[PDB]
């Protein structure tokens, strides 16, 4: 029972620290209403926020929760392109995007695929990482803890540990290097429907206290060594894979191919191999083989909940065409993405917008009866979506259409 | 006047009601995306859109919290996205202020990731009690990397050292500065593999993230290019040598968009109490991680802890291309001792390839200027072109600089679990 | 030797096949010279490149063809090497001035501060094939197969019933659409075992087939092994010997031997060795000239020097220990040193000179791979010794000056 | 003096007072005697000590060797010598020299340029020429580095310190400068030519009158090290492959389809598709930066070994793009291309002031200075280099694509 105004004045004499609001303030709504206002004195233009909104949001799921100092929302453009005919199932894609084109042209690279007879997907591995950095007094010492980690017996101590802090976390394997007398673990643990950051972070931690009663000298450095790789460029995601890696194909008739992507069987494998392929070596590019992944991984992203941040890895892609059929004029190609990462459980998927476009796509939440299916579902689509994209991006490049928008 | 009238007499020129208009398009092949030719408002061919969807769906009420209403599509459409059948809203927090070169910035981060927010405000916090953070531009030019081709490589060598040439560069600049009066032509770098010859244009864009100017020219350039050397045969606009939203070693060593270095010192007692840590623990997780870490996990430009989501929640805010995070993120973080005792903490963050842009794209729509007018550097700066951009760089190099300095602040004391 | 020439000049005899032909090597060689003497715009040019008195038995039918004489490289010894309580005295084949010297200055301070110590922690040569199937589908599917316990028995079967020596420790498989990379490895007792190994791959892509016969096999080298060419591959799952060493250099003999300071050598060492290598985009590449050392003793020991590519893969990093502080900590990794004792060119008698100097010439009977693990460690340990010097040469501002 | 005592009184002497052992040649009056002397005192500290007796020592040259390639040397290496060629090349035949110890290279290199010079030849062009050092200085902070690299990129910067870099020799003239911050960090790529030499030491001195010019300008400089690693270096580093080093250099051919058959024993369309999933898919999956080609580095390092250059330089001198592709009236014939941005070499000084090596060198027609071309021995060597790896890439891929490789 105060006024907005004297809580303002109750802040700025230090009593309670615009973020901490909402744990006193009643209504979510009001304390990022007055969030706001406190932000406006200290702009060179007051009225900025006026544009931003904030009104009728539910706050009740993201407060303590995806966000903190919370003054309002941003509304992302959704398109749906599809259907994508993918695995003998229909998928409506949701994506969330800024760029012109980007919808029309994946939607096109759908409807290429479709008229072909449709795309096959599988999922070739499955574990979230993390590759914490330890240090033991000498080089001599971490060979020791990575023979003994090598070994069945070490081996099985350390997952009984890493799986007792979840039902879901389940130790698949480790691949540990050194550097001296510093050992970065890689730990690689399947983790049901969530991405599995946080649960791997927590089963590596407990994990980690365990090996610590064997070798009392090891000096646990950082949970995360930046071997895991989350979030940077690095080879050993594209390498070792990370999360989900998965395959997609299609053959698209060379009568497709022309009336639809405007463009010959030829061409989208010349341009192919001299730009994916070639192009991305003289760049001196590791993992990305491919025209824009990274913007079909970014839209559905953003749409579905997931973390937008990890487009960094989960970008990674080799595309590739080839000449098909029995006169040789269809097109053949296959997207691989060794490190898809990926969930339909916690985080942003909490939210109920982005719990809609994962709805649309059938994988919302958790898959009882059968735990990750939901998330491998989603990566698939991720796969499946980027080919589409690849399809019709690699034809207006052949074609000299990019100019078109 | 609903219950269906037969398609003939539905042909229109309010128009009449949804159930007919969507019989019109089932019965007849008018294509989802073209609806708000018809329609009378953006929204409605909106709503009509997500009930043709709702159809093709296993979960016919799946859309319901999706929101769609309330919302400009005019700035949207034909600009923005296609297929429309709503929006997305991501939770925007503040982190600030942030000290940066004698200046105060309240940076807006959209993000659904818990304690992002919270954690970059720490690190600002840090930076501020240490007196401030500075920062400078090192290079600024968006590129394309055009694939082009000629019938044997002693022709594309041929090409190479013409275009190496004071009289090649020249006419080639000449062709591709017509293109807009923002469009200068700084450098071209080339590579040869063979009888390809790759070509990384680069310029200048004002104020614009300028991917589609720098296009225009390149194809301009090109099209001057084959006038001398009419057996050339351009390929793609773009043979991934630019390198655009691919990671690549180019954009790392060569720089593309904004290279960027920021700096601070944050004094003993603030690594203490604010990232409850000390300089010493800072520095060899540092060394450690962001160093050792990235260089045995085979990382091109990935020296940092978390520099991607920093850019990504800005970017996401602010209307910026989040796709472009693979490059952007390209960071090296270093820190050292610094100060009498040597117990002061210095950091620095350097990022050779910020891709960003105030003017065009998402930055056309209202609550993305919102988020950019809150840091002063919404649209075009008329009286020095391009300044609004670096400005945003370099907040986005501060904001990275925050983020690194609270991430191995709770990593060197155990508080990332 | 003159009347020859005329028969050669006819065809149905390429200049390839003389020692086929002749009753002796040299007198092959010579003729063989002679012959392309004539071809050259400068005749005389084959005057100072010697032939005379060398074995050319045991070279001809295995280690070159068309021979017209061999190339001396000066070797010069550094040492002695402390490492894991023994005495090395390491031959370096080179002609870059002041490298054996530099290297045994590295041997010195080592030396003075105790000695290095060394530990293998892994060994396997790989070969990475490239199959292919007709569809991703399927060759998803043979990956599968590959990972299961049954599929990976049998090729392990087929692969380890070439050799003795042919162990199959694992497989690494990577997808990109329909074609399959798949990384064979396993130790090879002292031999470097590329031949080994690609022996043994063959005859398990085969049994594969069996299970596959829609899968065709493109090469038995895909580039996925890697053999040299710079792969993050190597760098990250290591190939051949995977070997880490290490020393703690007192802070006096930093300064007497080594003319710095430990201060200045870590600043060094991080800046240009982590940082430098990170700004110029090196996978593998931090360490000063791991790469000099690594090549001088591969010429010495006829090892193949082709291979320094991934051999030369190598971290060091240094840090300040000791009471105060003040001692040099210095540690180099090196996770695909590829080498064996016996095999290819060290089967050579000078070469095998050179081997015996460090006490692993040929096959160790009673531990098999014993000699060419030992030859790994002095390798890496002599790595580190070239890692001080230069290093400190660097600190100092004395590179050029030297 | 010391040919009045006797080779065990020397012993007994250098272990007497402590002589080091690299000093022997100061001592000791031929130079022979002096390598004998060390061979009997390593002798004694070997667990076998007859282990040198095949370790050649005796009729060497050893006055070129001291004080410029070797140091405490014992002996030499004979590594065998065999020709591969003749390599048509730019309408001239090669008679290329290759030191190695590995079986059916030199033959599988010599199919490779048979089937070349079946194909009518093949043509190669230089397409950049420059050493580079890579320094690596500090300022107090990096706002002071950003203004040093801001200096650097204004013509009148870089034209004083060119002078500075100039001044150091008649053949080193500074083409151009990179620069990259990392923090209060800069590091400084000069790029030079540098005549007919390989050029790492004429290089080296230009930048350290270079960086101490700089100085004058920015006393606050710390100079960390002439090499920070940003070279680079017999490291690998994509830096090399993007900006080249050396030089760098590109060669093609067109190989008849009827002798891809015969003599490759193999078909057009076999080699690219192994080359495009090979070389290039391969490559990729394997994270592999600049080594998209078969064996590049055996060539590379077995012309090293054999004309005097720095064998460890095959790290980065390997690098490698083969691409191969179907040509002709019929798409039948084979057109291969590789590409070679880093080719570090010389033909002056060195290992190349050898008189052996220097006889392979003249094989070759590239020995010494070209007096009239400075820097043309050393272009067309290496024009060779990239010729050679591509008559190289012919015959392995061809193997390769046949089942042949391992017999
Ligand atoms: C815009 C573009 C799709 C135009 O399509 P087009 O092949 O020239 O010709 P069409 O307009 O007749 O349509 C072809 C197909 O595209 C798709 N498509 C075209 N315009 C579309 C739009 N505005 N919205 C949604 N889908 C669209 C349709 O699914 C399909 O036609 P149909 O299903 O009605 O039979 C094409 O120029 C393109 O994809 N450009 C490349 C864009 C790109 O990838 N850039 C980088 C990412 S932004
Ligand atoms: C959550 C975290 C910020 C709290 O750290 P802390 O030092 O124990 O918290 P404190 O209560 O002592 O406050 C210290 C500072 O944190 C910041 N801070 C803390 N909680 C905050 C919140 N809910 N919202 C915004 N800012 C917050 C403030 O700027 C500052 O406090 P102040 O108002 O007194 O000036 C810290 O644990 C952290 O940063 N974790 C790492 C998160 C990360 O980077 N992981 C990956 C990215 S999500
Ligand atoms: C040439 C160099 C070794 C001389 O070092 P220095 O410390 O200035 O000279 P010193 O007379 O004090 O000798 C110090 C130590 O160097 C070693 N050393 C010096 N000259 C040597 C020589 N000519 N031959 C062999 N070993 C030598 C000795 O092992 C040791 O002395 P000691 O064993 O007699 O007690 C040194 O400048 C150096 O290593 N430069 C770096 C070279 C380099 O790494 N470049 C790249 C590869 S070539
Ligand atoms: C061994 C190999 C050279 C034989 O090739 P082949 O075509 O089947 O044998 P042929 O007798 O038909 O000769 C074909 C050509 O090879 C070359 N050649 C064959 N044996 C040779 C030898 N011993 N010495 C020199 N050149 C030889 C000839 O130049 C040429 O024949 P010609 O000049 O007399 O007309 C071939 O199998 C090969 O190159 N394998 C791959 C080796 C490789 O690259 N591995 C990795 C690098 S060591
Ligand atoms: C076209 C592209 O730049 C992506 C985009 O425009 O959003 C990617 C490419 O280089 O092909
Ligand atoms: C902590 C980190 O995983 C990023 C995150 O949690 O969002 C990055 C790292 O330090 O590896
Ligand atoms: C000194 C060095 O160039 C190697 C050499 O000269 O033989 C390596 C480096 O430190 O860059
Ligand atoms: C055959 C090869 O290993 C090189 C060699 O054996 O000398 C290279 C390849 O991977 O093709």
Redesign the interface.
């Known amino acids: 029972f105060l006024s907005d105004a004297e809580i303002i004045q109750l802040v700025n004499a230090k009593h309670i620290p615009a ?1 901490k609001l909402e744990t006193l303030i009643e209504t979510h709504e009001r304390g990022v209403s007055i ?1 706001r206002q406190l ?1 406006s004195k ?4 007051p009225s ?6 904030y009104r009728d ?1 539910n706050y009740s799921l ?1 407060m ?20 994508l005919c993918l695995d003998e199932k ?1 998928f ?1 894609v ?11 042209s994946t ?1 096109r690279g759908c409807r290429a695929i479709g008229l072909g007879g449709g795309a ?1 997907s ?1 999922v ?1 591995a499955d574990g979230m990482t993390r ?1 914490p ?1 330890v ?1 033991l007094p ?3 010492d ?2 020791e803890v ?1 023979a003994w980690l090598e070994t069945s017996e070490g081996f099985a101590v350390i997952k009984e540990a890493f799986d007792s802090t979840s039902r879901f976390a389940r130790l698949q394997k480790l691949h540990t ?6 050992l ?1 673990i890689r730990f690689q643990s399947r983790s049901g429907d969530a991405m599995g950051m ?1 649960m791997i ?2 089963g590596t ?1 407990k994990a980690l206290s365990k090996l610590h009663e064997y070798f009392p000298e090891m000096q ?21 894979g990370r999360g989900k ?1 998965v ?3 299609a053959v698209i008739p060379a009568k497709v191919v022309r009336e639809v992507l405007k463009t010959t069987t030829e061409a989208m494998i ?2 192919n ?23 079909i ?3 559905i992203y ?2 579905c ?1 997931q ?6 890895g989960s ?2 892609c ?1 595309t ?1 065409m080839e000449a098909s059929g029995p006169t040789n004029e269809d097109l ?1 190609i ?3 993405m ?1 490190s898809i990462e990926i969930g339909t459980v916690g ?2 998927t909490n ?7 994962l ?2 796509l ?1 994988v ?1 939440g958790a898959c009882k009866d059968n735990p990750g299916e939901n998330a491998r579902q989603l990566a698939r689509i991720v796969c499946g979506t980027v080919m589409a994209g690849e399809l019709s991006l690699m034809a207006a ?2 074609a ?1 259409h ?2 078109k ?1």
């Open positions: 973020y969030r932000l200290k702009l060179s233009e900025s926020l006026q544009y931003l909104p949001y993201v303590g929760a995806c966000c903190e100092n919370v003054i309002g929302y941003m509304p992302i453009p959704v398109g749906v392109a599809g259907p229909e409506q949701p994506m969330a995007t800024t760029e012109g084109c980007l919808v029309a939607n096959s599988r070739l590759g950095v240090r000498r080089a001599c971490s060979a990575k290097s050194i550097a001296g007398r510093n970065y946080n972070s927590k931690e646990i450095l950082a949970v995360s060594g930046n071997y895991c790789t989350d979030k940077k460029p690095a080879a050993i995601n594209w390498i070792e890696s395959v997609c194909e010349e341009v191999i001299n730009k994916n392929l070639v192009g991305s070596a003289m760049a001196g590019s590791i993992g990305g083989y491919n025209a824009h992944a990274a913007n991984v970014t839209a953003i749409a909940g973390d937008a941040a990890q487009n960094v970008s990674n080799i590739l053949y296959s997207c691989t060794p985080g942003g939210l109920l917008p982005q719990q809609a476009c709805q649309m059938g919302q490049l052949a000299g990019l100019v928008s």
